[PDB]
Amino acid sequence: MQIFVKTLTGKTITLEVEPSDTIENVKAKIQDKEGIPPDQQRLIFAGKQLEDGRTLSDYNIQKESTLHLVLRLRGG
Amino acid sequence: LQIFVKTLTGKTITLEVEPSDTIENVKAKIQDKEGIPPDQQRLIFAGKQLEDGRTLSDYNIQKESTLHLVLRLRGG
Amino acid sequence: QRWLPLEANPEVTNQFLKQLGLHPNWQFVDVYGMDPELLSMVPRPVCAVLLLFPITEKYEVFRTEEEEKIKSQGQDVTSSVYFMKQTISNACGTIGLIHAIANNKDKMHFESGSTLKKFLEESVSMSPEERARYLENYDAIRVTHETSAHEGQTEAPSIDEKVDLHFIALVHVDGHLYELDGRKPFPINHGETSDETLLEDAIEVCKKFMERDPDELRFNAIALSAA
Ligand SMILES: [Br-]
Ligand SMILES: [Br-]
Ligand SMILES: [Br-]
Ligand SMILES: [Cl-]
Ligand SMILES: [K+]
Ligand SMILES: [K+]
């Protein structure tokens, strides 16, 4: 199935995924397409940050759902 | 060697450190003394924001240097 | 209705203002300290300060006494001040930014379809309580706040967690320094200021907050500076 990821610039990343895919898998796919390291990525759906070990199915993310990508800042 | 960390309130925290200590180590020492979690800490020296993986030596922070602490707190 | 609390981080606040369609003539910067040397690092001019401070029991007795004194004894508030009440747990981040922009409207530029521009045009004649109910219902700002709460160097807490930290805005309107806090029933007039002295005068109010709570370190100030 296809899902959409919108960035702060308003750009759309389209991913091919399965309901059984983990949030880690999705972050790997975003790294493949955009070159953003997974550890910097925060995926948001229904106002909630998604956890690495859970599946798209766990969050009722379906075909053509839109997620939001935010970047965790490094601080120091 | 001793260094000083000034907060926005103007309070001075004294730390015992080595030149080889990382910015992460200094933040851990501030957590030990003040109970501020490292993730909320942002350290500045000579108007420049410091990175976690670098040493006091990297920034020429010496005996009795003063650093500035900004807190990345969340507010309602 | 319950929002997530925003990180006191200029990168987060500047991104939020961009999403609300403000042109970046003004950008938030950190304030490192309150002495002249560290304040000299803030770019000038400054048209607002946002202060994050702790809501402690000591703070609350002072707030109670201040409210009772001003209700019974009076104060001057110019008709030009834009004030809104807080009726939403943890929206103080949004209400602080609206206070800062709404009270500098003449110095601000907005893009095509700015959601903040639309909010300000529609709420211009509303009472402070009506402005608060309008924000409760204003989806475009609620979803922008939601995104912004997930940004910063820290993770957003659970929506159920109690927040004991609070944002207020300090501005110059019509010759005076106003503290705008949606938790209070009115602006607080802190006396005379000017465009040229707002940063110094605002920081003097921030100092009084810190002196009333001398054992607290949980403070952050950001200054809205010319870009
Ligand atoms: Br950062
Ligand atoms: Br130490
Ligand atoms: Br100025
Ligand atoms: Cl103005
Ligand atoms: K007005
Ligand atoms: K003003």
Curated annotation (Swiss-Prot), chain A:
Covalent cross-link site, Glycyl lysine isopeptide (Lys-Gly) (interchain with G-Cter in ubiquitin): 6, 11, 27, 29, 33, 48, 63
Domain Ubiquitin-like residues, every copy: 1-76
Outcome, altering residue 60 to R: Decreases affinity for UBE2R2 in CRL2(FEM1C)-UBE2R2 complex
Annotated consequence of substituting residue 65 to E: Phosphomimetic mutant that binds and activates PRKN
Site (Essential for function): 68
Modified residues (Phosphoserine): 65
Post-translational modification: Phosphorylated at Ser-65 by PINK1 during mitophagy. Phosphorylated ubiquitin specifically binds and activates parkin (PRKN), triggering mitophagy. Phosphorylation does not affect E1-mediated E2 charging of ubiquitin but affects discharging of E2 enzymes to form polyubiquitin chains. It also affects deubiquitination by deubiquitinase enzymes such as USP30.
Impact reported for residue 66 to A: Abolishes CteC-catalyzed ADP-ribosylation
Superkingdom field: Eukaryota
Glycyl lysine isopeptide (Gly-Lys) (interchain with K-? in acceptor proteins) crosslink site(s): 76
Residues the record marks as site: Interacts with activating enzyme: 54, 72
PTM-bearing positions, type ADP-ribosylglycine: 76
UniProt protein name: Ubiquitin
The species this protein was found in: Homo sapiens
UniProtKB/Swiss-Prot annotation, chain B:
Modified residues (ADP-ribosylglycine): 76
UniProt-recorded name of the protein: Ubiquitin
Effect ascribed to mutating residue 72 to K: No effect on ADP-ribosylation
Residues of the full protein shown: 1 to 76 of 229
Top-level taxon in the UniProt lineage: Eukaryota
Chain positions of cross-link Glycyl lysine isopeptide (Lys-Gly) (interchain with G-Cter in ubiquitin): 6, 11, 27, 29, 33, 48, 63
UniProt modification remark: Phosphorylated at Ser-65 by PINK1 during mitophagy. Phosphorylated ubiquitin specifically binds and activates parkin (PRKN), triggering mitophagy. Phosphorylation does not affect E1-mediated E2 charging of ubiquitin but affects discharging of E2 enzymes to form polyubiquitin chains. It also affects deubiquitination by deubiquitinase enzymes such as USP30.
Localisation: Cytoplasm; Nucleus; Mitochondrion outer membrane
Domain Ubiquitin-like: 1-76
Consequence recorded when altering residue 68 to G: Loss of DTX3L-mediated polyubiquitination of histone H3 and H4
Effect caused by changing residue 65 to A: Prevents phosphorylation in case of mitophagy. Decreased localization of PRKN to mitochondria
Residues bearing PTM Phosphoserine: 65
Consequence when changing residue 74 to G: No effect on ADP-ribosylation
Membrane topology summary: Peripheral membrane protein
Residues the record marks as site: Essential for function: 68
Residue positions where (Microbial infection) ADP-ribosylthreonine is found in the record: 66
Stated consequence of mutating residue 63 to R: Abolishes HLTF-mediated polyubiquitination of PCNA
Effect annotated for changing residue 65 to E: Phosphomimetic mutant that binds and activates PRKN
Protein task: Exists either covalently attached to another protein, or free (unanchored). When covalently bound, it is conjugated to target proteins via an isopeptide bond either as a monomer (monoubiquitin), a polymer linked via different Lys residues of the ubiquitin (polyubiquitin chains) or a linear polymer linked via the initiator Met of the ubiquitin (linear polyubiquitin chains).
Site (Interacts with activating enzyme): 54, 72
Cross-link Glycyl lysine isopeptide (Gly-Lys) (interchain with K-? in acceptor proteins) per UniProt, renumbered positions: 76
Record note on what altering residue 48 to R does: No effect on HLTF-mediated polyubiquitination of PCNA
From Swiss-Prot, chain C:
Subcellular location: Cytoplasm
Chain spans, region Interaction with ubiquitin: 5-10, 216-221
SUPFAM superfamilies assigned to the protein according to its UniProt record, in alphabetical order: Cysteine proteinases
Top-rank lineage group of the source organism: Eukaryota
GO terms assigned for molecular function: cysteine-type deubiquitinase activity; deNEDDylase activity; peptidase activity; ubiquitin binding
Known outcome of mutating residue 92 to A: Increased interaction with diubiquitin
GO BP field: post-translational protein modification; protein catabolic process; protein deubiquitination; protein ubiquitination; ubiquitin-dependent protein catabolic process
Catalytic EC class: hydrolase
Regulation: Inhibited by monoubiquitin and diubiquitin.
Main location (coarse class): cytoplasm
Site-annotated residues for Transition state stabilizer: 86
Keyword Protease: yes
Positions bearing the site annotation: Important for enzyme activity: 181
Residue intervals of the UCH catalytic domain: 2-226
PROSITE patterns: UCH_1, UCH_DOMAIN
Catalytic activity: Thiol-dependent hydrolysis of ester, thioester, amide, peptide and isopeptide bonds formed by the C-terminal Gly of ubiquitin (a 76-residue protein attached to proteins as an intracellular targeting signal)
Tissue-specific expression: Highly expressed in heart, skeletal muscle, and testis.
Modified residues (Phosphoserine): 127
Keyword annotations: Cytoplasm, Hydrolase, Phosphoprotein, Protease, Thiol protease, Ubl conjugation pathway
InterPro entries referenced in this protein's UniProt entry, alphabetically: Papain-like_cys_pep_sf (IPR038765), Peptidase_C12_UCH (IPR001578), Peptidase_C12_UCH_sf (IPR036959), UCH_AS (IPR057254)
Region feature (Interaction with ubiquitin. Crossover loop which restricts access of large ubiquitin adducts to the active site): 149-156
Cited Pfam families: Peptidase_C12 (PF01088)
Primary role: Deubiquitinating enzyme (DUB) that controls levels of cellular ubiquitin through processing of ubiquitin precursors and ubiquitinated proteins. Thiol protease that recognizes and hydrolyzes a peptide bond at the C-terminal glycine of either ubiquitin or NEDD8. Has a 10-fold preference for Arg and Lys at position P3'', and exhibits a preference towards 'Lys-48'-linked ubiquitin chains. Deubiquitinates ENAC in apical compartments, thereby regulating apical membrane recycling.
Miscellaneous comment text of the record: Identified as a tumor-specific antigen in colon cancer.
Subunit structure: Preferentially binds diubiquitin; the interaction does not hydrolyze diubiquitin but, in vitro, inhibits the hydrolyzing activity on other substrates.
